[PDB]
Amino acid sequence: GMTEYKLVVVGADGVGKSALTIQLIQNHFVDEYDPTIEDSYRKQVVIDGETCLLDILDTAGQEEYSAMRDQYMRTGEGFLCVFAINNTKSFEDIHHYREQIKRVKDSEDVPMVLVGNKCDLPSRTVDTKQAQDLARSYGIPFIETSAKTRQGVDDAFYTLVREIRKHKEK
Ligand SMILES: Nc1nc2c(-c3c(Cl)cc4c(N5C[C@H]6CC[C@@H](C5)N6)nc(OC[C@@]56CCCN5C[C@H](F)C6)nc4c3F)ccc(F)c2s1
Ligand SMILES: Nc1nc2c(ncn2[C@@H]2O[C@H](COP(=O)(O)OP(=O)(O)O)[C@@H](O)[C@H]2O)c(=O)[nH]1
Ligand SMILES: [Mg+2]
Numbered sequence: 001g002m003t004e005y006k007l008v009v010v011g012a013d014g015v016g017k018s019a020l021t022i023q024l025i026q027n028h029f030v031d032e033y034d035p036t037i038e039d040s041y042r043k044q045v046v047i048d049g050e051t052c053l054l055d056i057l058d059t060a061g062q063e064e065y066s067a068m069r070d071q072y073m074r075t076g077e078g079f080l081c082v083f084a085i086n087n088t089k090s091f092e093d094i095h096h097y098r099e100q101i102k103r104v105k106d107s108e109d110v111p112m113v114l115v116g117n118k119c120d121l122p123s124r125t126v127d128t129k130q131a132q133d134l135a136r137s138y139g140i141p142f143i144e145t146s147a148k149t150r151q152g153v154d155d156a157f158y159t160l161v162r163e164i165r166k167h168k169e170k
Contacts, residue, residue: 002051009058010097011082012090016117019147021058024157029148074104078111078164085116086123111163112140115156120146
């Protein structure tokens with residue numbers, strides 16, 4: 001039987017969470033996917049010889065901290081924390097997203113990858129060095145992506161799968 005991985009994509013509105021998820025599932029860039037739709041998407045992919053069923057939650061909508069929302073987010077096994085390289089605020093919000101994940105998982109060691117999206121744009125405001133220094137302080141990988149060109153998309157999701165797999169085999 002295939003191994004199921006529950007991945008959750010988090011980050012500020014408009015950073016490219018939906019475009020990244022759709023690039024992984026469908027291999028095409030979808031410009032302007034409904035900013036309000038939160039949904040889960042499935043992809044069967046073989047990673048390092050293992051047949052994986054990736055169940056990916058693309059977050060959207062209201063910020064809320066109910067017992068239900070916490071319980072739901074806690075089911076995630078690994079998290080992509082996404083910011084956009086042309087939106088400093090989205091990068092500044094990363095500490096918040098990481099803290100919410102650590103809080104509901106009750107752990108300092110949650111599989112996580114920091115993703116700096118929209119690297120195809122020339123309007124960079126978040127330096128690569130500042131972002132990689134933050135990932136280094138967290139002990140997690142940092143991958144720059146472009147959902148528009150597909151650059152780094154497989155690397156970001158498959159690195160997260162490998163982090164979850166490593167966590168389960170400890
Ligand atoms: N209950 C649990 N939730 C979570 C979350 C979670 C989710 Cl799912 C949504 C939002 C969210 N939304 C989802 C998408 C993107 C933006 C918008 C609202 N639409 N927004 C904010 O923060 C937004 C800001 C601005 C206003 C005040 N906040 C604090 C900072 F200033 C940043 N955090 C969110 C968040 F952390 C993540 C991981 C977990 F494990 C848990 S557990
Ligand atoms: N140039 C560029 N635009 C992108 C990229 N990813 C997403 N976008 C655009 O940025 C906007 C927000 O993307 P979206 O996927 O809806 O982000 P979400 O709100 O995090 O789900 C849309 O206009 C997307 O088409 C990317 O890598 N490069
Ligand atoms: Mg979206």
